[PDB]
Every structure is written in C-alpha cells, then in structure tokens.
C-alpha cells in the first residue's frame, strides 16, 4: 500500500481533478464569445432602429 500510494495513487487522483476542472472551465470560453455575440445582435437590432 505504501509503494502504491506514493506512486500511482496519491498524485494520480490529484492530477485527475485538474484535468476535469480545466476542460469544464475551458468549455465556458465558447460560452462567453458566443454570449458576447448574442449581445451584439440585441444591441445591433436596436441600432437598426437608431442608426439604420
């Protein structure tokens, strides 16, 4: 258990979180860039009432 723990176990179950975290977080890049662009549509549409 000592051998295992200090090799595969401890750092491995550590490093898993990281991978998880960073990819779910990274998904929310696409969220913002789209969300931006969604807003751009709402402001543009009202600027085709106030600039065209």
């Amino acid at each position: 258990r000592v051998n295992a723990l200090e090799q595969v176990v401890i750092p491995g179950i550590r490093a898993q979180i990281r991978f998880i975290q960073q990819v779910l977080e990274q998904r929310e890049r696409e969220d913002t860039f789209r969300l931006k662009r969604i807003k751009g549509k709402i402001e543009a549409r009202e600027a085709e009432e106030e600039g065209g």
């Binding site: 051998n3 090799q7 960073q22 990819v23 990274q26 890049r29 931006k36």
Partner: protein, 457 residues
C-alpha cells in the same frame, strides 16, 4: 496618411479606411503626449483597420494623433559582425554599447524552407554534459524539447551547455570551419530570475567573442515577446546557409510566449483557449520550427533546441502537451535525483530520442557510439524497475539476475550522471562506459553482440 483615431485601447485600435496599408506594415504614431510608437498593421479594412499597439493605453490623446506608413513590411539588418557579439533588445539594440551597422537590410518575417531542399543529418554536436549526447544523441536532425518542470531551474542547465559545446574535425562529424564557436540564443520571454541569472553568465561565457543572445530584457512590452523569436532567427538563417556555419538557437521558456500571445487572442476574439492557453498557438509556431531542419545544396544549419519549463509537475496543462505534438519526442530532467544532490540531474525515463544513429555512425564519432546508444538505456531502465516490484510483495522480490541490473543503476548514478560542470569528450564518455558495462556479463548483451566487446573493455 490618416489623421484621427476613434478608439483608444491597449492592444489594437481603429484607424479609418485603408488604401495603401499592406499586411504587417510598419506604422509610426505620435501620441501627441510627446511619445512615439509603432506596430504592425495586421488586418487591413476600408472600415476600421486595426494597428498593433506596442505599449500600454496610458499616454494617448485625440488632441494630436497621426498614423503614417513607414515601410511595407518588417525588415532589419544583419551584419557579418553579428557573430561574436551580444545584441540585447530589438529595433535599436541596447546591449549597452553602440549598435552594429545594418549591412544587409532584409526581411525579419521569416524566409521559408522547401521540404525538398532538405537532406539527412551528418553532424554531431559534442557537448560536455556526457549523459545526453551519449544516449539521446544530440544531433541537429532532432529538436527535442528539454523540459525543466517546477522547482527544477531552466537557467542553470541552459547556462552550462553555453561554453560547454565544442568542435572537432571529425569527432563531431563535420569540420571546425563548418562549426564556429558562435551560437545564437532567442528568447521566448525572459523573466526576473531568468535575466538576473544570465547577467554573470555573459562575462564568463564570452558573449563578446563566441555568442549572440537576443533578449527582450524582461521589461519591454508584451508584443515584443511575439517579435524577438523570428527576428533572432532569420538573422542566423543567412550566415548559416549562405555564409556556411552551424548555429543552434537555444530557446528559452515558451510560457511567457503564451502569456503575451493570449492577450491578442481575447482582443480580436479568436480561439485563445485550447485548455486555458491558446488554440491558435501552433499556427504562429509553424515558422519557428520549420527552420529547424537540415538544408540540401548548402552546408550549415539552424536547429531549435526548445528549453521550456512546466507550470506543474504534472502535464495536464497545455504548456508541454501542445509542444509534444507539434515537435518530436521529449528529453526531461525531472526531480528524481535532484532531491538528493545530483547535478546535473538527468532522467530520460519517459524520454524519446527520435534519431540516434543518424547524424552519427561509426567513425563519424566512435565505433561503439552506434552500439552503446540503446544499451545504457534499457540497462539502467531495468535497474529502477526492480525497486518498484520489491516493495509490492514484502520488501524483496529480487533474484541473482536482479543483483546485477540493480547495481547497474548505482554504477550509472553518481559515477556517470553526476559530473559537476566538467567538460567531457565523446571519447572519455564511451571508453569508460564499457567498464560500467562490465557489471553485467558481456558478450551477449541486449542490443550489442560480439563486435565491440573484445575491443572495448
């Protein structure tokens, strides 16, 4: 010429219309606060062209502004007295002494390299840190990234090999007029520690008689970090191929490259997140690691020797991952042996040396160089392997065909890996390597057979 601006911003901004703006053109902008800037004109529009702001947003006004085209694209001089001199900084180099005359003014964008204008390696680089250049076989036909990792210094190691690369007529493959003592260093971004370290290193190595080190100086604006690589490069591409010389671009940490690069990608709304660092990374790097081959029909090369650290002692981060993929294989150092005292610590347990029998042969280096390549690797490998399975089943699991492989890892340890900063020839390395290959019964070895056994003891 264009008077008026309609956006004050820090990385990119509005310049009305365009009718003569090239892509990647040099513009000059008087901010009206008495300051002046430049930049590249990357993206040209008859609506709003946006120009590369070279410094922070402060110190700008609309009271006085002008945009004025200076040159079509980026360009800069390459002296033939560039070699044997350090030219710190960029544009006007401040190496703290006068600048050398831009003798041949040519572009600094990059000049591509035809894939049918390449030829297989035939040069070896004899460097004084034995362990690498023996097993991994440091040749110019590989560009393996050296990964330092956290709490492992990137500087010390890079510092080492600086003066410690040497040239022979035929223990290095090619001649010593085909390899000068000149080398080139290109910074991907230097930091606090990285700079405060190489200060002492210039006056000791000979950055006035055998080394060129372009820097960013650690305190120049972010966009400078996406300028100095390819600028540093192109320079050397000239004296290397056209004038005939071998030079090695000894890079530095690509972390600060990402750093600067990313801010452009969120101010143009590109793909600046592959897993927290750019998805557009590789596209710009096509040029850096394109010239890192070996030319055909000319002699002398350019080879990128990536040296880059990792934000964590795990590779879950894009930093080393995207680099792995781009380039070929890996060489590492890790911290297995560093915790105990060994210096230089070198662990090529998860390493991959792509070439190791090309660019060397027999008589191009030594006879037993080609044979003792793979040997050490697996002899040593299977040393550390034992210490794994012993502890799994009680505290032993060892046999008499273990006691020999066991001690082959001690024998490789402080005798071979540890060396200080003491220059070692390819002769002194392989010669004595065979007396450490006298810890396992000779004659029938894993990759060696009886053809170097009775010749090298």
């Amino acid at each position: 010429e264009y008077t008026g601006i309609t956006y004050i911003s820090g990385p990119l901004l509005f310049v009305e219309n365009a009718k003569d703006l090239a892509y990647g053109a040099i513009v000059d902008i008087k901010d009206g606060t008495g300051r002046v800037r430049g930049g590249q004109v990357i993206e040209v529009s008859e609506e709003y062209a946006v120009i590369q702001v070279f410094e922070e947003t402060t110190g700008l006004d609309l009271a006085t502004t002008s945009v004025s085209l200076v040159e079509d694209v980026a360009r800069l001089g390459v002296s033939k007295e560039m070699l044997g001199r350090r030219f710190n900084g960029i544009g006007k180099p401040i190496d703290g002494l006068p600048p050398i005359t831009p003798e041949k003014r040519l572009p600094i964008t990059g000049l591509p390299l035809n894939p049918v204008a390449r030829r297989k390696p035939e040069q070896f680089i004899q460097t004084g840190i034995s362990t690498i250049d023996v097993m991994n076989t440091l040749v110019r036909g590989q560009k393996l990234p050296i990964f330092s990792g956290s709490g492992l210094p990137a500087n010390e190691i890079a510092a080492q090999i600086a003066r410690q690369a040497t040239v022979r007529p035929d223990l290095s493959g090619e001649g010593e007029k085909e390899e000068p003592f000149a080398v080139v260093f290109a910074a991907m971004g230097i930091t606090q520690r990285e700079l405060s370290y190489f200060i002492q290193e210039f006056e000791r190595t000979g950055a006035l008689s055998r080394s060129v080190l372009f820097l960013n100086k650690a305190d120049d604006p972010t966009i400078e970090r996406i300028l100095t690589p390819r600028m540093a490069l192109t320079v050397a591409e000239y004296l290397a191929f056209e004038h005939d010389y071998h030079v090695l671009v000894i890079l530095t940490d690509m972390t600060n490259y990402c750093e600067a690069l990313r801010e452009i990608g969120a101010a143009r709304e590109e793909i600046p997140g592959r897993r927290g660092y750019p998805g557009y990374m590789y596209t710009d790097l096509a040029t850096i690691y394109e010239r890192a081959g070996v030319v055909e029909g000319k002699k002398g090369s350019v080879t990128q020797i990536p040296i880059l650290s990792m934000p964590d002692d795990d590779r879950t981060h894009p930093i080393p991952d995207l680099t792995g993929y781009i380039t070929e294989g890996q060489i590492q150092l890790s911290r297995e042996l560093h915790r105990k005292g060994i210096y230089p610590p070198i662990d090529p347990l998860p390493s991959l040396s792509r070439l190791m029998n090309n660019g060397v042969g027999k008589g191009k280096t030594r006879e037993d160089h080609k044979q003792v390549s793979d040997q050490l690797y697996s002899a040593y490998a299977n040393g550390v392997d034992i210490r794994k399975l012993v502890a799994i089943i009680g505290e032993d699991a060892l046999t008499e065909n273990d006691r020999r492989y066991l001690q082959f890892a001690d024998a490789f340890e402080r005798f071979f890996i540890n060396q200080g900063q003491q220059n070692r020839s390819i002769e002194e390395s392989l010669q004595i390597a065979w007396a450490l290959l006298s810890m396992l019964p000779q004659g029938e070895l894993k990759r060696i057979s009886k053809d170097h056994i009775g010749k090298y003891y």
